[PDB]
Amino acid sequence: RSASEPSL
Amino acid sequence: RSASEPSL
Amino acid sequence: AMGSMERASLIQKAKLAEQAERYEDMAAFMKGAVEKGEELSCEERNLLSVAYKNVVGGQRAAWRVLSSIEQKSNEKGPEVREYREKVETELQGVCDTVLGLLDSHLIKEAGDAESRVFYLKMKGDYYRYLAEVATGDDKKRIIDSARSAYQEAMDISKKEMPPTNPIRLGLALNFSVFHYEIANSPEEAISLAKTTFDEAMADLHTLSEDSYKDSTLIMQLLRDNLTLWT
Amino acid sequence: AMGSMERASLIQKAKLAEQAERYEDMAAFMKGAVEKGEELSCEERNLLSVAYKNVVGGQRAAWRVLSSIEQKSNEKGPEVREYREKVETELQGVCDTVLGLLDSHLIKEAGDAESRVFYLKMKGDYYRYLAEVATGDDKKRIIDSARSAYQEAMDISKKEMPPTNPIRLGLALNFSVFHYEIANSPEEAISLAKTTFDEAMADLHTLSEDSYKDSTLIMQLLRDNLTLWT
């Protein structure tokens, strides 16, 4: 699956 | 901390 | 609920819940904070986003596990479908809660580009999570709601933020994922990811060392995706 | 709740929830299964234990984070204490639920050594988690309830199970942790862990390859603890 904006 | 019986 | 708690105490407790990895509690503290009716600061928007991203990320991961089991059973009782539906309904409920906070009244009070783009991106994101589980023609309308929110965010971001701004970069990253994974538009996804990467690379010279680390962390995700997609 | 669901469907859904890492749901499915009033099989006891161990393990991890923050603030408002109390209360509630299932009526219907030792050990474990957050003299009585449950389990285990039985080994491991971490009796903990390790080592010759792997996995925890404690 593609990566989306992480929890940062 | 000491190790206790794991979830297996 | 959490109507009797001070706003500042709700923000403080959301930060404690984040430290404790209690994201359901964090989301409920932040929902209470939004419902106080005051606009949120940059750090508060991030707490809101962290809380719901982690809640819905757990629900999405579980829904995927269940959907895969259900699809295999379809190569033996209603249980797998019932339980996938239960997780699905809970997930939809958390997306509808987030979209409700944005509509009542986060987006309409958001005048600065940083806040308005953040919220419109969130709106894109939670309609995209709805779309992941939708079947239709519910599905088309939900996909259109995601695309429209992302597109408005993108138009403001391109007028008002530098190409390295981490929110602009995270918006473009998530819209590219919307195109590849939801809208069946892998070429649009790849074009978006490449253009956004190249325009950020060109602007890195303007950044401090800390800003450069923030921007390049999201650029690396665009590059990882392009490597996966090509 | 979950009074309208078939027992077999509750067990099936607990297995799906475990695959999805949805331990709160798994615990609620297993609580519904116990409340059907039939005894549980070996595999069902394990599902019950896995579900609640993971629920309370998350709560314990969060309580520890919050307690540490609270203790530092005591070298600035009620929030840290309030939120630690909220997590604490939720944790106590899950322990009381487990202890209630055991008392109504799992332990009294459990006649075979494997089931009776399993449940008495569970009773020890959930009073031990209560004790971790207790202050008193509530604390002494809760510590005594843990010790008494463990001791009854140990007496049956030593009469009725071989020294390698994984439940007997996990009981002895958790009672040794009770002694070191709760009862301020590090020497009793070390003695118990060493005697249990040595008597299991002596009986491994009797085991099949799979049984030997099961027993030696828990023996390795006794050894890790002894290395930590000495």
From Swiss-Prot, chains A, B:
It is found in: Cytoplasm; Cell membrane; Mitochondrion; Nucleus. The modification Phosphoserine is found at S4. In skeletal muscle, isoform 1 is more abundant than isoform 2. It comes from the Eukaryota. This modification leads to destabilization of the protein, possibly through proteasomal degradation. Belongs to the protein kinase superfamily. TKL Ser/Thr protein kinase family. RAF subfamily. It is linked to Noonan syndrome 5: A form of Noonan syndrome, a disease characterized by short stature, facial dysmorphic features such as hypertelorism, a downward eyeslant and low-set posteriorly rotated ears, and a high incidence of congenital heart defects and hypertrophic cardiomyopathy. Other features can include a short neck with webbing or redundancy of skin, deafness, motor delay, variable intellectual deficits, multiple skeletal defects, cryptorchidism, and bleeding diathesis. LEOPARD syndrome 2: A disorder characterized by lentigines, electrocardiographic conduction abnormalities, ocular hypertelorism, pulmonic stenosis, abnormalities of genitalia, retardation of growth, and sensorineural deafness. Monomer. Homodimer. Heterodimerizes with BRAF and this heterodimer possesses a highly increased kinase activity compared to the respective homodimers or monomers. Heterodimerization is mitogen-regulated and enhanced by 14-3-3 proteins. MAPK1/ERK2 activation can induce a negative feedback that promotes the dissociation of the heterodimer. Forms a multiprotein complex with Ras (M-Ras/MRAS), SHOC2 and protein phosphatase 1 (PPP1CA, PPP1CB and PPP1CC). Interacts with LZTR1. Interacts with Ras proteins; the interaction is antagonized by RIN1. Weakly interacts with RIT1. Serine/threonine-protein kinase that acts as a regulatory link between the membrane-associated Ras GTPases and the MAPK/ERK cascade, and this critical regulatory link functions as a switch determining cell fate decisions including proliferation, differentiation, apoptosis, survival and oncogenic transformation. RAF1 activation initiates a mitogen-activated protein kinase (MAPK) cascade that comprises a sequential phosphorylation of the dual-specific MAPK kinases (MAP2K1/MEK1 and MAP2K2/MEK2) and the extracellular signal-regulated kinases (MAPK3/ERK1 and MAPK1/ERK2). This is RAF proto-oncogene serine/threonine-protein kinase.
UniProtKB/Swiss-Prot annotation, chains C, D:
Pfam families: 14-3-3. Homodimer. Interacts with KRT17 and SAMSN1. Found in a complex with XPO7, EIF4A1, ARHGAP1, VPS26A, VPS29 and VPS35. Interacts with GAB2. Interacts with SRPK2. Interacts with COPS6. Interacts with COP1; this interaction leads to proteasomal degradation. Interacts with the 'Thr-369' phosphorylated form of DAPK2. Interacts with PI4KB. Interacts with SLITRK1. Interacts with LRRK2; this interaction is dependent on LRRK2 phosphorylation. SUPFAM superfamilies: 14-3-3 protein (SSF48445). The modification Phosphoserine is found at S9. This is 14-3-3 protein sigma. InterPro entries: 14-3-3, 14-3-3_CS, 14-3-3_dom_sf, 14-3-3_domain, 14-3-3_sigma. Keywords: Cytoplasm, Nucleus, Phosphoprotein, Secreted, Ubl conjugation. Present mainly in tissues enriched in stratified squamous keratinizing epithelium. Adapter protein implicated in the regulation of a large spectrum of both general and specialized signaling pathways. Binds to a large number of partners, usually by recognition of a phosphoserine or phosphothreonine motif. Binding generally results in the modulation of the activity of the binding partner. Promotes cytosolic retention of GBP1 GTPase by binding to phosphorylated GBP1, thereby inhibiting the innate immune response. Also acts as a TP53/p53-regulated inhibitor of G2/M progression. One of its GO terms (cellular component) is cytosol. The record marks R60, R128 as: Interaction with phosphoserine on interacting protein. SMART domains: 14_3_3. GO terms for molecular function: cadherin binding; identical protein binding; phosphoserine residue binding; protein kinase binding; protein kinase C inhibitor activity; protein sequestering activity. The gene is SFN.
